[PDB]
């Protein structure tokens, strides 16, 4: 019964330590035994993941920022809900939440790569689709006896060609 006494003592401590005092100490130990008996419903002290969820909820309570989690957990937000929530990112607090969304947006942008854009004109005509959406580009390849190559590519379909 080591875990089912230790977590109960943990909730004894983290509810007595609140500015929200326990004169309804019997209500609060009812809350604690409800919390622990839904907490075991994932594991029943038979799975190694038992301590992880406990650490999540425990350090969320003892976080401060925020302390208002104590008030909302004593005035509602029932404990069998908060095994199945797994809302650790979602709670305690919201400024950190919007920080996380900004971070995720930044990462999702920065994982995108190179997108060289291939300026087009209507001067030539494609070979596959015969459209004047030529992704043209110019550069020199051969020896000194000639000017540039007149490289060609169609952007409407992907058709690369060359002019003489």
């Amino acid at each position: 019964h080591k875990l089912r006494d230790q977590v109960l003592k943990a909730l004894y401590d983290v509810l007595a330590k609140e500015s929200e005092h326990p004169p309804q100490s019997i209500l609060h130990t009812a809350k604690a035994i409800e919390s622990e008996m839904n907490k075991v419903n994932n594991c029943d002290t038979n799975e190694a993941a038992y301590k992880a969820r406990y650490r999540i909820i425990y350090s969320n309570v003892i976080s401060k920022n925020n302390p208002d989690l104590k008030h909302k957990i004593a005035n509602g937000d029932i404990t069998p809900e908060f095994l199945a929530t797994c809302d650790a990112k979602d709670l305690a607090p919201a400024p950190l939440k919007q920080k996380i969304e900004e971070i995720a947006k930044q990462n999702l942008y920065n994982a995108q790569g190179a997108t060289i854009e291939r300026s087009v004109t209507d001067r030539f005509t494609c070979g596959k689709c015969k459209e004047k959406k030529v992704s043209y580009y110019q550069l020199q390849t051969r020896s000194a006896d000639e000017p540039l190559t007149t490289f060609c590519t169609c952007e409407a379909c992907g058709n690369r060609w060359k002019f003489s």
Binding site: S59, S63, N65, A88, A92, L96, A111, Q112, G113, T115
Partner: protein, 48 residues
């Protein structure tokens, strides 16, 4: 996870001569421990 500064605290446990051992062990854990993925693969990007 939710703390403002993510921290790791570790110690050597055994039932003088600390600094260079701990520095080498630090260097080892930085250089060797894989996290996920498959090694010999590097940065990856998405084209549309």
């Amino acid at each position: 996870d939710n703390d403002e500064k993510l921290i790791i605290r570790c110690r050597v446990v055994r039932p003088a001569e600390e600094d260079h051992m701990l520095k080498k062990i630090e260097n080892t854990m930085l250089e060797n421990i894989t996290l996920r993925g498959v090694e010999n693969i590097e940065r990856v990007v998405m084209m549309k």
